[PDB]
């Protein structure tokens, strides 16, 4: 499935070049701009442990998820990954634990040492 394909073929979008955040574009977006550090970004998403059968469904699918890019308001992989996305893009991200919740996890949904997988749709972004 998509997690396997991303591990094998996905682009390494990390500074370390550790294949810790891997990306495949699912739907090509608009233009060439990407959000910048500090911009408010607006997304839809689906996330799971990478070996889970189903995406987590514990958030409202209609209401945009909003955060300030690059400010440590979300896991490291999202700050790196959303920064690479064009408006209207849908992307797959496969994420090693050190770019997510690491050895601590976040129990009960996220165990220690968990690899995560997301589908993210970038709806919009705007600067200060
Ligand atoms: C700077 O580092 C952090 C900053 C903030 C947090 C709190 C959790 C944070 O969640 C996330 O960053 C990711 C990506 C954005 C969507 C939510 N995230 C989740 O990990 C998912 C998770 C994915 C794997 C399957 C289980 C669900 N979390 C959620 O979807 C739910 C709804 C379960 N969750 C509690 C929230 O989305 C809570 O709202 C948040 C709002 C901002 C940041 C975080 C969570 C954790 C951090 O590091 C571990």
From Swiss-Prot:
State the UniProt keywords alphabetically: Acetylation, Chaperone, Cytoplasm, Isomerase, Nucleus, Phosphoprotein, Repeat, Rotamase, TPR repeat, Ubl conjugation
Q: Gene Ontology cellular component?
A: cytoplasm; cytosol; extracellular exosome; membrane; nucleoplasm
Q: Does the keyword Isomerase apply?
A: yes
List localization entries.
Cytoplasm; Nucleus
Q: In which tissues is it expressed?
A: Widely expressed, enriched in testis compared to other tissues.
Induction per the UniProt record: By androgen.
Q: Name one GO molecular function term.
A: protein-macromolecule adaptor activity
Q: What domain of life does the UniProt record list for this protein's source?
A: Eukaryota
| N6-acetyllysine modified-residue sites | 16
Phenotypic consequence of residue 16 to R: Decreased acetylation; promotes interaction with AKT1 and PHLPP1
What is the protein's known function?
Answer: Immunophilin protein with PPIase and co-chaperone activities. Component of unligated steroid receptors heterocomplexes through interaction with heat-shock protein 90 (HSP90). Plays a role in the intracellular trafficking of heterooligomeric forms of steroid hormone receptors maintaining the complex into the cytoplasm when unliganded. Acts as a regulator of Akt/AKT1 activity by promoting the interaction between Akt/AKT1 and PHLPP1, thereby enhancing dephosphorylation and subsequent activation of Akt/AKT1.
Q: Name it.
A: Peptidyl-prolyl cis-trans isomerase FKBP5
Species in which this protein is naturally found: Homo sapiens (Human)
Note the residue range shown relative to the complete protein. 16 to 140 of 457
């Amino acid at each position: 499935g998509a997690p396997a394909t991303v591990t094998e073929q996905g682009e390494d979008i990390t500074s370390k070049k550790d294949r810790g955040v891997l990306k495949i574009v699912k739907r090509v977006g608009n233009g060439e701009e990407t959000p910048m550090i500090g911009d408010k970004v607006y997304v839809h998403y689906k996330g799971k442990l990478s070996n889970s059968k189903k995406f987590d469904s514990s958030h409202d699918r209609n209401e945009p998820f909003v955060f300030s890019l690059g400010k440590g308001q979300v896991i490291k992989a999202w700050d790196i990954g959303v920064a690479t996305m064009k408006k209207g893009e849908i992307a797959h991200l496969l994420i090693k634990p050190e770019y997510a919740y690491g050895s601590a996890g976040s129990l009960p949904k996220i165990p220690s040492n968990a690899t995560l997988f997301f589908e993210i749709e970038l709806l919009d972004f705007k600067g200060e």
